Structures are given as structure tokens and as C-alpha cells.
């Protein structure tokens, strides 16, 4: 076990595994990746249960801090941004403002408990359950859509503000609905969930967005803002260099 | 309708806290609990989704998910925090920042990470599973035994991870204190289950009560509705919850306030 660096226990499919890799990369941390293979029982295998009681990906070992283990992608990101800010004095992907950090946590916990889990069941009942049961598939498909509605309405709100301050010349127009914000030349430019800066709250959704297509959800069509917002993230070098393996 | 909710936002205080909850809401009691343990004075407003109080304009903007619990930290320009996981963390950052003492938290980066590990575990794998078992076992448009069975299996699996974890904390506690019997306990001569400190409280993180432990209290008192008999199959969890459920602040939180 190395005494400097990080080790990330993941799995080829694991979306929360790519989520950690992403943040790990955006922050310039050097990490090793070990893909546990559950089709042999290495996830519940004791050497790892010590690192993660939940016996599953994703898990992180902070070699710097006496090989400390952090399971649960949500906690891993808060540990990573905290350590990064403590080290440089620069809150990259985070915020040195308590009010912003709570809003960031709000969206982070909202993603980990109300997005990934709903997408998870939506998949189960649609692909792995022991029988086709529509009422159950539609339950998560509907819930997952509602959550994208929440995210989408928030981003359109942040956008409205931007497109309405860098173009106060036609604000009332882009506000009354008379004319779509699609026509403002200040559209394209990226907006985020909190702090008008990229943070882990925005990143936490990406690995899960690339997959709600196999659940029948077409973000491109039914969630415009969520679409741009994802496209802005996928286009990041660090993310590109991360997503895959 | 929701004029009351729109009224409240026209008379917010400049200090104190307001907690939007619901009689059933377990994460509502979870915030009340931590709010109480930290000595914070709060007002509680039970939204009745029946009159669409959650659809009120003022509520949704201060809380995008339009669900409960939601905490307004009036002292901080009515800063609104809508996730239960985010309400706990905020509360502890403030208490530590103010008093300079990490009650229910920690001032060591390593410990905080362990705390947040469990915190995310409960809010993301524990509460949501229990919710699905409750749904298929009681409110879903048709009975799907396969569904009910799976979600009751998962809470039991999750409860197993917290059990084996507290079981480790106990083995470590009974071996540290009660040194007049450590040799045996390890040798195998004595069961160790008969140590004087066997019913003593063990905590998930740092040998102290944290928000990682309390988060489970509300959900622990609910799993009896899906068959889980904690006292039997999850003894360690049993003592742990009992210890917590016996604290004056927690019982104050419980019996509504």
C-alpha cells in the first residue's frame, strides 16, 4: 500500500466510480484504479470490507492520511474538495463560503439519494428484476423525470438571470415569454447549480446522465438546460481523460 | 390553499430557525433531533401537501425539490437548506464555528470523512430502501411481492453492515476497558459477551455520539413495519438505538415540539 497518492476501487460500469474519477482528475490528484470483480466475490472479500463496510464500489484510499478509507461517492467528493482547499487555499469545485457549501451539499445529497437510487431501480425493473412489471418501472421513470425537472428548472432560472443581466436591453422580452431566451446571444455560455462556478454538485450528476437514455429518458429533447449543462461538462479535458478507464 | 406559507415569508424573523416538516417525515425528526442536541431554538411548520402548500411560490424557490425537511437559517439571510444530509452538516459546521467545540461532529479531517461516509450511507442506501419496502408493502397501485421482498432484503443487508460495524466497536471497547479479562476474551476461555462493558454505548465514529449515529434513529424506529425486529436479529443495533432513543433531547424531538 503506497504512502503517497490515492487508490480508487471501482467497476467498469459503476457510474459513481466515474464520478469519483472525474473529481479526482479535475483536482489534479494522482490515483490508482482497481476494478473489483463481483462475479468472483472480491467486493465482499474482507481485504476490502475493511476499507468499505458496505462491501461495494466506490471506495477510496487516501494514502497520504495513513491509508484512510472513504466509501460512498458522496463522502469521497467532500473529502477530496476539503483536502484540496486545505492544501491550496483555493476552493476548486467547492466554496470557501459556508452558505455556498450548504447549497452545494444540498444538491450533492439530493443527487446521491434522489437521483442515482431512482435511476438504479428504474434500471432494475426494466432489465434485471425477475419479471416485467410496468407500474414499478414507471414509478422510477416518473420520479427520475421529476428530479430532472427540478434540476432543469433551477438551471433555467440561473440562465434567465445571466441572459437578463448581460442583456438588460431586452430583459422584459426574455422574461415575459414574448421571445425565447434561445434568441439571446448570451445563451451558449455555461451556467451552474451553485456559485456561478463549476462545483462537485454539477459533476455528481454527469455519470448518471449518460445513462438515463437506457431508461427511455431523452435529456436532449425533454431537458434542454440539463442537456447543455451536461455537454459543457463532458467537454472538459479532465472529465474526458477520466471517463473510460 | 397556501396563503399561510406565503404569509410566513412576509414575516420571517431575523434570527433563530424555522423547520418545515411533516408529522410522519422521519428525516424531519432527524433534523429536530440534531437541532435539539445542539441547543438551537427552532420553529416547526408542518406542511400539509394536501392543500398544496409545497407548491406555494415562496417555498419552491427556497427549496427546489419541494419536499421536506427544509431548514431556514434566519441568521444567515434566511439561508435555506433542503436536504436532510445537508441540514445536519450545516448545523454542525455552525456549532463548531461558533462554540469552537465539535459537538456531534469532529475537528479532524479524517474523522469528518468517516462521519460523512455513514451519513451518506444512511441517507442514500438506508432511508431510500426502507422507503421502497414501505411503498410496495403499503401504498403501491398493486401488490408485487417480489418488490416488497427485495426491498426488505436490502434494509436487512444494510442493517447487517451497521451491525458488524458496531460489533467491531464493541469488541474493541470490551478489550480496551475491562483489561482484567482481555486475555480470556481473546484466548477463548470467556465469551466476552459477559463483560461488564457489554451493554455500554459504542459509536460509529470516534467513540463519541455523532450525526452519523443519530441519523439512523428515526429510520430505526420504523423498520418494525416491514418485519425487521431489531431487538432480535440486530442486537448491536438494538442497544445502540436504545441508547440514543433514551437521551432527553431525542425524546423531546420525538414527542413533537
From Swiss-Prot, chain B:
Belongs to the GST superfamily. This is Transcriptional regulator URE2. Coiled coil: none annotated. It is found in: Cytoplasm. Signal peptide: none annotated. It is an enzyme of class 1 (oxidoreductase). One of its GO terms (cellular component) is cytoplasm. [URE3] is the prion form of URE2. [URE3] is the result of a conformational change of the cellular URE2 protein that becomes self-propagating and infectious. This conformational change generates a form of URE2 that assembles into amyloid fibrils. [URE3]-aggregates sequester soluble URE2, which then fails to retain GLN3 in the cytoplasm, resulting in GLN3 activation and consequently derepression of genes that are required for utilization of poor nirogen sources. [URE3] can be cured by GdnHCl and by deletion of the molecular chaperone HSP104, which is required for [URE3] propagation. The chain holds residues 98 to 354 of 354 of the full protein. GO terms for molecular function: glutathione peroxidase activity; glutathione transferase activity; phosphoprotein binding; transcription corepressor activity. Homodimer. Interacts with NNK1. The prion domain (PrD) is a Gln/Asn (Q/N)-rich domain, which is unstructured in its native, soluble form, and which forms a parallel in-register beta-sheet in its amyloid form. Residues 108-257 form the GST C-terminal domain. Its EC number is 1.8.4.-, 1.11.1.9. Keywords: Acetylation, Amyloid, Cytoplasm, Nitrate assimilation, Oxidoreductase, Prion. GO terms for biological process: negative regulation of transcription by transcription factor localization; nitrate assimilation; protein urmylation; regulation of nitrogen utilization. It comes from Saccharomyces cerevisiae (strain ATCC 204508 / S288c) (Baker's yeast). Its main location: cytoplasm. It comes from the Eukaryota. Disulfide bonds: none annotated. Glutathione binds at residues 27, 54, 67-68, 83-84.
